[PDB]
Structure 1
Amino acid sequence: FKLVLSSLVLRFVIGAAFLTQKFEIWDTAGQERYHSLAPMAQAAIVVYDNEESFARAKNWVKELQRQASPNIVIALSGNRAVDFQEAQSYADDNSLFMETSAKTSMNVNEIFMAIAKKLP
């Protein structure tokens, strides 16, 4: 399967983008500039940390739900300034979601091992 996504995939698995675990995982550029032309994928995630990250994640899932092939499953990553209750209300309004910490490697193994068993 093909997954579409600096440090959080670094704890899980030379190159920053591609890492084979099959987990065939592709990584996105931190810049806001070349945002369109994204779709090639059967799995996907969305990551935020700053509430702007949250906002970009919003219009990002709002790009995804519309454009793609119908089958693909999505997963969201927290990475304070925002209520979790807010983020979770948003997430369950639109139906897998979690907050993660890689230095202790908290939910690092998990979100991947939960994304894997989802794909039919």
Structure 2
Amino acid sequence: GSALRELKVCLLGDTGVGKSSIMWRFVEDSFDPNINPTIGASFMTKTVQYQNELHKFLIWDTAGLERFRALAPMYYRGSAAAIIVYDITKEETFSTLKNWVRELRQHGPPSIVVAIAGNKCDLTDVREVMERDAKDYADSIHAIFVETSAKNAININELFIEISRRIPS
């Protein structure tokens, strides 16, 4: 209330990139190879101690399926941070991510914390998006950048720790 800081965070990105899998790894420490595409938007929370302070993440997990694109503003508006996810093996998903950045910039404060997650980083042999290029783009928009794997539990915690560090509330 005074001791516990609520942090609204929204996951955005193309269908199939791993938004929900990132959330399930963070919250439930599990991975499902057969998780189904999200309908509408899902919700989970997690209470953590980062930077010697208590935070409760309020995580909105949006559907990336096309018919739900117009629903996303109901979830990203008023968020302290937006996590925009792409798939390192599909360059088109990074182009989609740039469209999400434009959508945020049209509708939210320039001060919103943006994190870019290049997910499925366990799939090293079939990479299409070079890490150097994705990092450089993230820097150009003042975003957090991590390559993640929900499957192999890589950089998921780091992602949320850095979001917490950057939110000035």
* Same fold at TM > 0.5: yes
Q: Which moved more, 1:46-55 or 1:28-37?
A: 28-37
| Counterpart position of 2:99 | 59
Q: Which structure 2 residues correspond to residues 7-86 of structure 1 after superposition, within 5 A?
A: 7-13=21-27, 17-21=42-46, 22-36=56-70, 38=73, 39=77, 41-49=79-87, 50-79=90-119, 80-86=127-133
- Give the Å deviation of 1:70: 4.0
- Residues 31-76 of structure 1: CA deviation (Å, up to 9, x unaligned): 1233235135221110000112111101100111221134321100
- Residues 8-42 of structure 1: CA deviation (Å, up to 9, x unaligned): 111101xx821111100101102123323513522
Q: TM-score, normalised by structure 2?
A: 0.64
Unaligned segments of structure 1, at least 5 residues: none
Instruction: Give the length in aligned residue pairs.
Output: 119
Q: Which structure 2 residues correspond to residues 94-109 of structure 1 after superposition, within 5 A?
A: 94-95=141-142, 96-109=144-157
* % identical equivalent positions: 51
Unaligned segments of structure 2, at least 5 residues: 1-6, 12-19, 28-40, 47-55, 120-126
Q: How far apart, in 2, do the equivalents of 1:40 and 1:101 lie? A: 27
Q: Which runs of 4+ in 1 moved over 2 A?
A: none
Structure 1 or 2: more strand by fraction: 2
Q: TM-score, normalised by structure 1?
A: 0.88
CA RMSD of aligned residues (A): 1.9
What SS does structure 2 have at the residue aligned with 1:85? helix
Q: Which amino acid aligns with 2:60?
A: W
